[PDB]
Design an enzyme around this catalytic site. Structure first.
Site, PDB file in Angstrom:
ATOM      1  N   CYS A  30       0.814  -1.203   0.000  1.00 57.09           N
ATOM      2  CA  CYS A  30       0.000   0.000   0.000  1.00 57.09           C
ATOM      3  C   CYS A  30       0.859   1.270   0.000  1.00 57.09           C
ATOM      4  O   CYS A  30       1.484   1.607   1.007  1.00 57.09           O
ATOM      5  CB  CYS A  30      -0.949  -0.023   1.204  1.00 57.09           C
ATOM      6  SG  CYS A  30      -2.301   1.173   1.131  1.00 57.09           S
ATOM      7  N   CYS A  33      -0.078   4.189   2.447  1.00 61.56           N
ATOM      8  CA  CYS A  33       0.408   3.853   3.787  1.00 61.56           C
ATOM      9  C   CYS A  33       1.785   4.449   4.052  1.00 61.56           C
ATOM     10  O   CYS A  33       2.083   4.894   5.163  1.00 61.56           O
ATOM     11  CB  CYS A  33       0.485   2.337   3.971  1.00 61.56           C
ATOM     12  SG  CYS A  33      -1.008   1.563   4.620  1.00 61.56           S
TER      13      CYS A  33
END
Length: 105
Positions: A30, A33
């Site tokens: 991700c 993130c």
């Protein structure tokens, strides 16, 4: 120090503190993130043990994500006395995180 939260130490860190626990739900794949990761780590240094900061890898722990209904990452949960009191979905500026935290101090 962002503690690594797993199914073993979960209760030990979340249901046994009186201090607000910020919990970051991430995964290695991700990108968004990666915006949060360094900020959470900075805030864990501003707050001298005043707030606990913890990380949950949704891959390694898909079921705990499931329990608190984490539809998408990144997402921060604010835990107070074992129970969720706040949810932040998506990456947000360091200042805006500090603004939601203060409420629960």
């Amino acid at each position: 120090s962002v503690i690594e939260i797993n199914d073993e130490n979960f209760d030990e860190v979340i249901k046994k503190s009186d201090k607000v626990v910020v919990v970051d739900f991430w995964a290695e794949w991700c990108g968004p993130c990666r915006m949060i990761a360094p900020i959470i780590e900075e805030l864990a240094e501003e707050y001298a043990g005043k707030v606990v900061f913890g990380k949950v890898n949704v891959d390694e722990n898909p079921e705990i994500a499931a329990k608190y209904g984490i539809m998408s990452i990144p997402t921060l949960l604010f835990f107070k006395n074992g129970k969720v009191v706040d949810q932040l979905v998506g990456a947000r500026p360091k200042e805006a995180l500090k603004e939601r935290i203060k409420k629960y101090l």
